[PDB]
Amino acid sequence: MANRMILNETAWFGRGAVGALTDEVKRRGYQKALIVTDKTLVQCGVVAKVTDKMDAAGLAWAIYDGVVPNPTITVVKEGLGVFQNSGADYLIAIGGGSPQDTCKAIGIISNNPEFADVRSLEGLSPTNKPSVPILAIPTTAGTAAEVTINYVITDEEKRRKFVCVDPHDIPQVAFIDADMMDGMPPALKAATGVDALTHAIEGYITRGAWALTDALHIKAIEIIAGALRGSVAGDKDAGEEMALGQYVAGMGFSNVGLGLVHGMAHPLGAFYNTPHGVANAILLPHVMRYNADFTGEKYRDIARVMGVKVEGMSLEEARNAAVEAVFALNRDVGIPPHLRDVGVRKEDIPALAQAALDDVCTGGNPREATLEDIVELYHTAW
Amino acid sequence: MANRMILNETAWFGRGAVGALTDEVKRRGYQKALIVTDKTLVQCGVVAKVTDKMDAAGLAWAIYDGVVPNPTITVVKEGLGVFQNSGADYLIAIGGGSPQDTCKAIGIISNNPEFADVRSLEGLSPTNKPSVPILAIPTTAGTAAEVTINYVITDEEKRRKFVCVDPHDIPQVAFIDADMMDGMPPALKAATGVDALTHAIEGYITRGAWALTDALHIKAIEIIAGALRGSVAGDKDAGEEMALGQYVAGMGFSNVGLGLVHGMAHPLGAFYNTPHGVANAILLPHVMRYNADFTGEKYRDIARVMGVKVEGMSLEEARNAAVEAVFALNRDVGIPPHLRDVGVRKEDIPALAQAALDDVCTGGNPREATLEDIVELYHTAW
Numbered sequence: 085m086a087n088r089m090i091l092n093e094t095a096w097f098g099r100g101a102v103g104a105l106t107d108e109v110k111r112r113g114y115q116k117a118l119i120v121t122d123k124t125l126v127q128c129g130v131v132a133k134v135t136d137k138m139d140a141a142g143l144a145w146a147i148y149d150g151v152v153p154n155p156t157i158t159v160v161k162e163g164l165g166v167f168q169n170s171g172a173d174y175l176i177a178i179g180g181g182s183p184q185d186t187c188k189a190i191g192i193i194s195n196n197p198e199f200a201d202v203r204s205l206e207g208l209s210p211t212n213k214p215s216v217p218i219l220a221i222p223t224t225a226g227t228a229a230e231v232t233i234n235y236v237i238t239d240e241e242k243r244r245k246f247v248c249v250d251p252h253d254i255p256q257v258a259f260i261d262a263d264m265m266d267g268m269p270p271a272l273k274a275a276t277g278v279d280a281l282t283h284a285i286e287g288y289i290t291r292g293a294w295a296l297t298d299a300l301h302i303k304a305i306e307i308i309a310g311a312l313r314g315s316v317a318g319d320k321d322a323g324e325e326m327a328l329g330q331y332v333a334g335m336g337f338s339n340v341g342l343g344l345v346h347g348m349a350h351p352l353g354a355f356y357n358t359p360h361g362v363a364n365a366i367l368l369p370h371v372m373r374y375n376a377d378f379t380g381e382k383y384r385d386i387a388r389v390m391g392v393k394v395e396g397m398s399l400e401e402a403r404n405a406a407v408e409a410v411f412a413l414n415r416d417v418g419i420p421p422h423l424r425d426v427g428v429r430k431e432d433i434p435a436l437a438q439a440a441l442d443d444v445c446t447g448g449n450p451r452e453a454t455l456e457d458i459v460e461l462y463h464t465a466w
Numbered sequence: 467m468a469n470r471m472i473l474n475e476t477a478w479f480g481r482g483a484v485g486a487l488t489d490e491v492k493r494r495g496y497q498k499a500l501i502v503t504d505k506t507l508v509q510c511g512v513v514a515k516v517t518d519k520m521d522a523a524g525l526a527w528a529i530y531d532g533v534v535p536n537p538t539i540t541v542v543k544e545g546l547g548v549f550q551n552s553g554a555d556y557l558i559a560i561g562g563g564s565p566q567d568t569c570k571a572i573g574i575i576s577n578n579p580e581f582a583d584v585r586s587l588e589g590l591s592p593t594n595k596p597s598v599p600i601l602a603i604p605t606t607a608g609t610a611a612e613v614t615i616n617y618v619i620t621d622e623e624k625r626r627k628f629v630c631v632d633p634h635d636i637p638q639v640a641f642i643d644a645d646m647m648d649g650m651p652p653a654l655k656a657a658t659g660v661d662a663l664t665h666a667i668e669g670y671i672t673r674g675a676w677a678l679t680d681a682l683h684i685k686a687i688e689i690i691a692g693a694l695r696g697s698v699a700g701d702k703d704a705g706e707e708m709a710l711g712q713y714v715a716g717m718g719f720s721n722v723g724l725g726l727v728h729g730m731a732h733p734l735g736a737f738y739n740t741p742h743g744v745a746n747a748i749l750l751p752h753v754m755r756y757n758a759d760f761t762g763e764k765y766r767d768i769a770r771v772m773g774v775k776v777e778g779m780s781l782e783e784a785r786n787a788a789v790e791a792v793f794a795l796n797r798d799v800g801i802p803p804h805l806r807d808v809g810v811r812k813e814d815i816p817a818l819a820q821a822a823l824d825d826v827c828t829g830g831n832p833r834e835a836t837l838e839d840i841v842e843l844y845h846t847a848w
């Protein structure tokens with residue numbers, strides 16, 4: 085069968101790319117924006133970075149800063165509520181994954197009112213209408229929500245992170261500038277950083293993978309690998325490299341699926357508020373051993389682009405080094421090695437597994453996994 | 467300053483990608499297509515491959531097949547006329563750069579009645595309104611018109627091919643299937659493929675080059691350089707690999723520039739009907755030399771992914787090996803080595819050099835060029 089690629093129709097890149105917004109807005113004759121963000125972001129005057137411009141350029145905006153980390157259905161519903169009484173024409177998402185995943189959730193239901201429950205919207209959400217135009221403005225080096233046809237909501241009632249996939253999500257225009265992401269404390273840089281490295285590795289070896297996907301993913305790894313460290317350290321250029329590499333990572337996995345790292349991280353999100361990027365970080369390499377045999381030459385390139393001298397190693401040698409370059413990046417960026425450090429309880433392993441076994445992402449893993457494969461992975465990552 | 471990237475919001479890739487067409491149209495309720503093609507494409511049962519699926523799916527379509535290579539203003543005028551007179555809702559473009567570029571011309575003017583003339587539309591087209599939605603379907607392993615933000619028209623009057631650049635022109639979906647491209651005779655696969663390697667190389671070194679665009683272009687060269695031989699020699703898997711290559715190149719250079727090769731090829735088309743890719747082909751290595759010294763480490767990369775063992779080389783050895791790699795491909799693919807061979811006239815060189823100097827692409831060249839520099843160039847390529 086054929087392979088479909090969904091990208092942003094327009095995207096702006098690099099420091100000050102947010103400058104382009106007011107004109108994008110103009111060129112499309114939008115009238116009012118609903119900004120969708122955190123209170124944290126509004127307080128550090130990150131949001132101001134955009135709103136101020138909108139002020140000079142004469143552009144109407146209102147705010148919903150109600151998004152909490154791991155955005156819940158109630159959060160989504162509130163935004164929709166705000167949006168629908170705003171007079172807003174479109175929406176601007178300033179934020180990482182939470183506000184951005186909210187905003188898409190918000191945009192879809194505003195045109196697919198049929199789905200007001202927000203659970204039906206999991207899977208390949210069967211939407212007849214394209215979302216309210218959205219301008220995506222990421223402020224983390226991670227999620228790549230600005231480019232992905234997916235968004236994840238938390239359903240408190242059912243303590244489960246559920247994933248929505250729908251080409252209708254796709255922002256009209258993405259503004260990716262490292263200026264908006266400089267605010268990120270070091271822990272948050274490392275976390276988002278690794279979320280993307282995860283994105284890129286899972287995408288490289290997912291089941292839908294193919295030529296275009298493979299190229300982008302490996303690029304993004306190459307970028308992330310050689311930059312997350314100095315970005316975590318503060319060097320500004322590396323922030324810009326990170327900003328890019330997570331964006332490249334999204335061009336792939338979005339259009340091609342992920343795998344079980346993400347499948348095991350979600351339930352972990354929903355169960356213990358474990359920061360999504362941190363979950364992945366811990367699992368990633370353990371899932372990489374679990375996957376090593378089913379990935380052809382792949383890990384060899386993964387080892388390469390992460391600085392390892394793969395030349396004349398056995399495929400087994402290369403497969404280790406890549407898993408090892410990963411363990412090594414997490415430690416060097418201050419991610420805690422074990423699940424116990426982030427307070428996972430073994431009594432929960434059988435649940436976590438079932439939730440992982442069910443999570444939409446898991447299907448992409450190159451190697452099918454039963455309950456008891458996952459029970460093990462969690463145990464050995466604990 | 468910031469970089470902008472303009473891409474297809476949807477694209478399908480893979481043998482049979484046209485199959486997803488009837489679907490897109492339906493998912494977004496258009497009503498009547500104006501198919502824009504060649505009489506040849508019609509006659510070689512190739513258009514049928516799409517009209518048959520649309521008939522079977524219940525979709526209405528009309529067709530304008532009046533297009534010629536290096537499409538004239540009149541061709542664009544006449545086509546539009548037909549569209550204005552068919553109740554056509556959106557447009558499907560089937561064919562190489564010629565019907566695709568004619569198709570964009572039509573889609574733009576039919577929304578920007580302002581430039582009903584087609585000269586007033588050269589350069590950064592001051593168009594106020596997005597083109598009529600165009601679904602693009604290439605039948606050549608070249609042009610990349612399905613993803614680029616530009617089209618080229620022949621002014622038979624002032625005889626010069628001129629280039630129009632406008633994000634409004636971007637097709638909504640692009641459909642990339644080698645199945646469409648199989649009919650190309652070896653000379654055609656050869657010509658259009660090296661147009662593709664020309665874009666990949668020009669866009670790799672063009673003035674606006676940067677991280678993301680370098681990545682695509684370098685991937686493109688890798689792919690093209692690896693498959694052209696086989697495509698031309700008949701390999702269908704080579705055909706598919708190509709189909710992708712040229713698209714990828716499109717993703718790069720649309721968003722960044724080309725340079726002297728296109729700038730000296732456009733005035734050659736206009737004067738002598740020299741096919742776009744053969745003009746490019748002949749011209750490419752010479753312009754490469756002229757450019758060598760102003761292209762950083764780029765040639766070293768170019769040479770590697772064209773199979774040259776750049777291992778122990780100096781940037782000098784390496785730059786030379788790149789220009790060399792191309793002379794090899796041209797030979798191997800059956801393109802004439804000299805402009806003399808394709809009817810170019812020493813008398814005309816001044817006029818051509820002037821034309822080249824004026825071409826929008828030229829200014830993208832890493833090495834600034836003068837009239838006399840272009841003269842030298844045409845002369846040394848003759």
Ligand SMILES: NC(=O)c1ccc[n+]([C@@H]2O[C@H](COP(=O)([O-])OP(=O)(O)OC[C@H]3O[C@@H](n4cnc5c(N)ncnc54)[C@H](O)[C@@H]3O)[C@@H](O)[C@H]2O)c1
Binds near residue numbers: 125179227247
């Ligand atoms: N299905 C998928 O493809 C998948 C993949 C990746 C991420 N996700 C989703 O992404 C979400 C996580 O998003 P996230 O990690 O970007 O962060 P976030 O939006 O959830 O929150 C991070 C915290 O950091 C603060 N913050 C954010 N940006 C900042 C900055 N620039 N400077 C200072 N402080 C900042 C915020 O206020 C917030 O409290 C989760 O809901 C996750 O499930 C899903």
Ligand SMILES: NC(=O)c1ccc[n+]([C@@H]2O[C@H](COP(=O)([O-])OP(=O)(O)OC[C@H]3O[C@@H](n4cnc5c(N)ncnc54)[C@H](O)[C@@H]3O)[C@@H](O)[C@H]2O)c1
Binds near residue numbers: 605617627
């Ligand atoms: N601005 C730019 O970036 C740039 C780059 C590439 C091309 N161009 C322009 O676009 C056009 C290039 O078009 P092209 O090179 O694809 O060729 P084309 O569409 O102009 O036509 C070439 C000939 O090949 C035939 N043909 C095409 N596909 C076929 C198939 N599958 N089977 C059998 N015959 C087939 C056509 O019928 C036609 O006779 C040129 O006119 C050129 O001026 C501009």
Ligand SMILES: [Cl-]
Binds near residue numbers: 144171
């Ligand atoms: Cl108001």
Ligand SMILES: [Fe+2]
Binds near residue numbers: 227279280283346360
């Ligand atoms: Fe993630």
Ligand SMILES: [Fe+2]
Binds near residue numbers: 746
């Ligand atoms: Fe070309």
